[PDB]
Amino acid sequence: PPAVHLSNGPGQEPIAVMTFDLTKITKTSSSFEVRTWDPEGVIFYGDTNPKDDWFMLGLRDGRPEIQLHNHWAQLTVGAGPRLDDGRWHQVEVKMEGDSVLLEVDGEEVLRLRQVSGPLHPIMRIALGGLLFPASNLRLPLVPALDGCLRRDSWLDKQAEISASAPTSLRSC
Amino acid sequence: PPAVHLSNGPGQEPIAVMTFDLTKITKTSSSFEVRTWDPEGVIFYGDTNPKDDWFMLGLRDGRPEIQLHNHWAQLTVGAGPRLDDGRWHQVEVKMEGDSVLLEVDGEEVLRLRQVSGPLHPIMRIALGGLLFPASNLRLPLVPALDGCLRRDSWLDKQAEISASAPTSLRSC
Ligand SMILES: C[C@]12CCC(=O)C[C@@H]1CC[C@@H]1[C@@H]2CC[C@]2(C)[C@@H](O)CC[C@@H]12
Ligand SMILES: C[C@]12CCC(=O)C[C@@H]1CC[C@@H]1[C@@H]2CC[C@]2(C)[C@@H](O)CC[C@@H]12
Ligand SMILES: [Ca+2]
Ligand SMILES: [Ca+2]
Ligand SMILES: [Zn+2]
Ligand SMILES: [Zn+2]
Ligand SMILES: [Zn+2]
Ligand SMILES: [Zn+2]
Predict the structure, then answer these.
(1) Which atom number of ligand 2 is nearest to the Cα of residue B48?
(2) Measured between CB atoms, does A165 come within 8 Å of chain B?
(3) How many domains is chain A partitioned into structurally?
(4) Is A161 left (phi over 0), alpha (psi -120 to 50) or beta?
C-alpha cells in the first residue's frame, strides 16, 4: 500500500494536519504502520488546545515515547521495543475509559491510566511534527523523523472537519 | 488508478471541498477523467465568493455546461460532445489570459473570452455539488451526478489551504 514520508526536507513542521469535531467522534483510536532507521523524532501530535491539552507520540533512543499534558496528567514516558530497525511495525494508540493504551505489533506495551477525562470543541492531529516549538515539549527532542507511514487511520473519519498539507506529501 | 464516486446517496452536497490561497496559485488549470451514464449533474463548482464570483462545470443533456457569474461576465453555455456514454473522458478547464478554456479528450471544445480579470483571498473548489442551493444557479439543474472521477488535479496543490470531506469518499 501507499506509504508516505514522515518528514519533508529539514523537518520543522508536520506533513499533514487533520481537524476533528470532538462532539462527533465515536472512535477514539488511531493506528498505522511505520518503518524507520531514525532513533528520534515525532510520529504524531494531537491537541484540543496547544497550550493546555496536548499529546505527542514519538521515538527517543529508538523506542516509543509519549508526552502528554492536560487537566488530569502531565507525563513523559518511554516504553516498548526499539522500532528503528527498518522493518514495518504496527502501532495503535487507543483511549479506553480514562486510560491511553499503546500497542506495538498487536501487543500492549504501555497503558497510561487516569489520564483522560471525558472525550474543547476541536481535536487536531499533526503527522510528523508538532503544532508548537519543540522547546515547549516537557522534554525537548528534535522532531524530524525520517521514516515511512502507511495503513494509517486517525480517530473517526466521519468527524474530520478538514485536513491541510503545507507542502507535498512525498512517497516512500 | 483509484476512481471516486461523484455523488453520495441523494446528491445534495459535494463529496469534497478544497480551499485555496489565491495569492499562492501559479497553476490556473484543473484536469480529470470522468465516466458516467448520467445526462445531468454538477462535475465541480468553484468560487471566490458564493454570492459574487462563481463557476460551475456540469452536464446537461449529456454535454458539458458551464455557468459563470463574476464582475466581468454572466453566462450559461453548453458545448462539446455528449459524455454520458459510460466511457472514460479527459477534461481540462484552464484560465488563459482573460479566457476560460474547456478541453475534452485533448481537444478544445469551448473558449469563454473576456470573462476573467486578474487571478478575493480564497478560492474554493467543490466536487460533485455546489456551495449554494441549485435554485440560485442562473439556470437550475439537479446537481446529483452519478459518475466516477479519477486522475484529478485541482489548481495548484502548493496553494491548497485545506480540504474537507463531509462523508465517506466512495470507490468507483
Ligand atoms: C491519544 C489520543 C487518543 C487516541 C488517539 O487516537 C489519538 C489522540 C491524540 C490526542 C489525545 C488523545 C487522548 C486525549 C488527549 C490526551 C487530550 O487530553 C489532549 C490530547 C488528546
Ligand atoms: C474556471 C476556474 C479557472 C480554471 C480552474 O482550474 C477552475 C476554476 C474554477 C473557479 C473559477 C476559475 C476562473 C475564474 C473564476 C470564474 C472567478 O471569476 C470566480 C470562479 C473562478
Ligand atoms: Ca530524527
Ligand atoms: Ca444526475
Ligand atoms: Zn483543556
Ligand atoms: Zn514489529
Ligand atoms: Zn468579486
Ligand atoms: Zn472521450
Answers:
(1) 19
(2) yes
(3) 1
(4) alpha
